[PDB]
Design a protein around this ligand. Structure first.
Ligand SMILES: *[C@@H]1O[C@H](CO)[C@@H](O[C@@H]2O[C@H](CO)[C@@H](O[C@@H]3O[C@H](CO[C@H]4O[C@H](CO)[C@@H](O)[C@H](O)[C@@H]4O)[C@@H](O)[C@H](O)[C@@H]3O)[C@H](O)[C@H]2NC(C)=O)[C@H](O)[C@H]1NC(C)=O
Ligand SMILES: *[C@@H]1O[C@H](CO)[C@@H](O[C@@H]2O[C@H](CO)[C@@H](O[C@@H]3O[C@H](CO[C@H]4O[C@H](CO)[C@@H](O)[C@H](O)[C@@H]4O)[C@@H](O)[C@H](O)[C@@H]3O)[C@H](O)[C@H]2NC(C)=O)[C@H](O)[C@H]1NC(C)=O
Ligand SMILES: *[C@@H]1O[C@H](CO)[C@@H](O)[C@H](O)[C@H]1NC(C)=O
Ligand SMILES: *[C@@H]1O[C@H](CO)[C@@H](O)[C@H](O)[C@H]1NC(C)=O
Lengths: 241, 6, 97, 241, 97, 6
């Protein structure tokens, strides 16, 4: 059945410039991060639901299909996990700062032996960001190591033929490594009208205060089922199904 | 792509 | 609980599901963004400048028995775009129930 | 039957930076302006064709269809005018600077009373330019008068719905007024779909020493059949059929 | 003469047609652009950085009996884009006769 | 959009 979170405050957008929200397939955004970053300190939808006590466990989980045809395209479950979408047991690690769903990255290693973030860095787990992002210069390095060429502004491309032979990249999160094979981190698109492959890593620096940060976006979540546990303030990963 | 609240 | 919410996948770039705002509910598709903390949808009072609401759904306050005005102005900047409007209050149904 | 322009020099492109040439439907470009602006003083194809005396009249004419789903999309005629595509009789304007096909505009008048480029200005007739482009604040004024809205960098959108309410614009070339109505100068596109119409006047400042320059692109040639005459350096317009 | 060259229209923004470079003809689409004066096509030897030729038709001189090499560099900037490469020589047939 | 040799 649905829930009805009542007396939720939301904004009504009257001006939104740029190509971005014109092109975007979606009408708006429901943010599910911490109230600490809420504009006008509005109480967020999950916090209001939580307060109203409408779910037994204050957790929510994402499954995202990586096949464009495959229905359902993904599944969010409000108040529990779904076992047909992941396999194994979930691996948890705690939130390091409560604003975004921020977590500690131990290091990122391209198999060839390019180790980025050796010494550890910070990452936010974000369902609203399509690709993986990381600091410009570090990502450039990563990109050249797997032979992707620049398009514009930190977006990279690989001739689709090569996908099948690139190195796997491992993100070590909380002890164990999470592995992204080439077909996981490349997106087959159609610019002009043709089969092109986007590199699934784009470089963009987030300024301090909050930055510099890696952003584990849908590319990651597309391979590893993610649970956001507001009750324990920990993120949980498992290989998807 | 799209990177959502800086 | 638990409430499954089916998302649509668009190019492995955009994942979005449907929610309803209002009594009776008005149905909006939204990304459930773990990277921000606000809910907003276009208003029917959007300026002709907002090319985005020429083609997205627009929330019409007058058709909701549960609408409480608020009027405070917000402004949000995403890595991908900014926007602004005024805040309002109503019932959110996940899904459009 | 064709023409064989022989011994033609042309560029073999090895690097082509940025989005624009990925997105385009075309492989390359065959420039048809005067020799003056040619890179490496290479002799242009039509120049080389007049030189091997391949055509009887050294003129070429363009019909461009304004319906995206029309067979043919338009027609370049090398060495004559195609009578089946125009109505009335050509009126010719003399080329002032023989480098681009440059001509003198007397004024652009918007039917609500706005007159832009009063006292005249210069304009190039360009088949490889989609929209009409004119200096930024002058097009800014034109766009407020017809009520379009800023999109990104000198381009404006209008609801396709509002198009029949819009005034007609009139460019006065060589004593004649050439009218473009709202269905002429606005252009239907898709990002998401429908209702998204571009306003066919883009604002761009071409700096001294060539510029300032207005560009009459496909929007104007789509309404007026263009004859480019190298024997006499005049450009002729007649209403396309 | 008169030689008719039929153009394909794309969204009223792009009008282009088919020509051939080489004996026997290799066919390319080009816009017959009165705003510039150079003819060019992607080279089969375009750098890996040249994303654009990976999805477009590429000219190969080694299949043309009438090619004369030239090799001087050329570079053009359009109001829309930039390119570079080297010049060559060959027959151009219009249409791809 | 395409505006062709500034
Ligand atoms: C329109 O809606 C607003 C949103 O509900 C109404 O006021 C806000 O209501 C919230 C609860 O949802 C209040 O409660 C707390 O606010 C603090 C932040 O504001 C207070 O603390 C800051 C610290 O930065 C202080 O400097 C401010 O002066 C406030 O005293 C949050 O940290 C809590 O999490 C919690 O949400 C907000 O204070 C209150 N403020 C704002 C700006 O919205 C508002 O009154 C409604 N207006 C009308 C006309 O109905
Ligand atoms: C490879 O192709 C090259 C490009 O065509 C060849 O070099 C060119 O050869 C032509 C032959 O006609 C030269 O052009 C002639 O010479 C001048 C034009 O150049 C001058 O133009 C500007 C003003 O427009 C002037 O101010 C400068 O001083 C230039 O010198 C005219 O008098 C002729 O009518 C004609 O235009 C080019 O100069 C030359 N271009 C370059 C970049 O060198 C080259 O020789 C070819 N090689 C092979 C093996 O094919
Ligand atoms: C997570 O949380 C508990 C208690 O807050 C802490 O002791 C534990 O060591 C943490 N583990 C990790 C991997 O962060
Ligand atoms: C165009 O130029 C010719 C000489 O080339 C001149 O005699 C003629 O009167 C001019 N016509 C116009 C319309 O300017």
């Amino acid at each position: 059945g649905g829930v009805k979170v009542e007396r939720q405050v939301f904004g009504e957008a009257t001006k939104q410039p740029g190509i971005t929200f014109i092109a975007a397939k979606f009408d708006g955004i429901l943010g599910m991060a911490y109230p600490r970053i809420s504009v006008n300190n509005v109480l967020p939808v999950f916090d209001n639901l939580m307060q109203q006590k409408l779910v037994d466990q204050n957790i929510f989980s994402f499954y995202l299909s990586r096949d464009p045809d495959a229905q359902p395209g993904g599944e969010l479950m409000l108040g529990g996990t779904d076992s047909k979408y992941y396999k194994g047991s979930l691996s948890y690690l705690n939130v390091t700062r409560k604003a975004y769903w921020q977590v500690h990255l131990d290091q990122v290693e391209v198999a060839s032996g390019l180790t980025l973030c050796k010494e550890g860095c910070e990452a936010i787990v974000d369902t609203g960001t399509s690709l993986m992002v990381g600091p410009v210069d570090e990502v450039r390095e990563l990109q050249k190591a797997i032979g992707a060429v620049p398009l514009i502004q930190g977006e990279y491309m690989i001739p689709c033929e090569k996908v099948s032979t690139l190195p796997a990249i491992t993100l070590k999160l909380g002890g164990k490594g999470y592995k992204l094979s080439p077909e996981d981190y490349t997106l087959k698109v159609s610019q002009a009208g043709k089969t092109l492959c986007l590199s699934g890593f784009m470089g963009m620096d987030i300024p301090p205060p909050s930055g510099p940060l890696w952003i584990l976006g849908d590319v990651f979540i597309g391979r590893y089922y993610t649970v956001f546990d507001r009750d324990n303030n920990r993120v949980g990963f498992a290989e998807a199904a | 792509x799209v990177v959502x609240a800086x | 609980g638990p409430i499954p919410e089916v998302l649509k996948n668009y190019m492995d770039a955009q994942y979005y599901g449907e929610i309803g705002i209002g009594t009776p509910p008005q149905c909006f598709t939204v990304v459930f963004d773990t990277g921000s903390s606000n809910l907003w949808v276009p208003s029917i009072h959007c300026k002709l400048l907002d090319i985005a609401c020429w083609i997205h759904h627009k929330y019409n306050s007058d058709k909701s028995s549960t609408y409480v005005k608020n009027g405070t102005s917000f402004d949000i900047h995403y890595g991908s775009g900014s926007l602004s409007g005024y805040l309002s209050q109503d019932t959110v149904s996940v899904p459009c129930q």
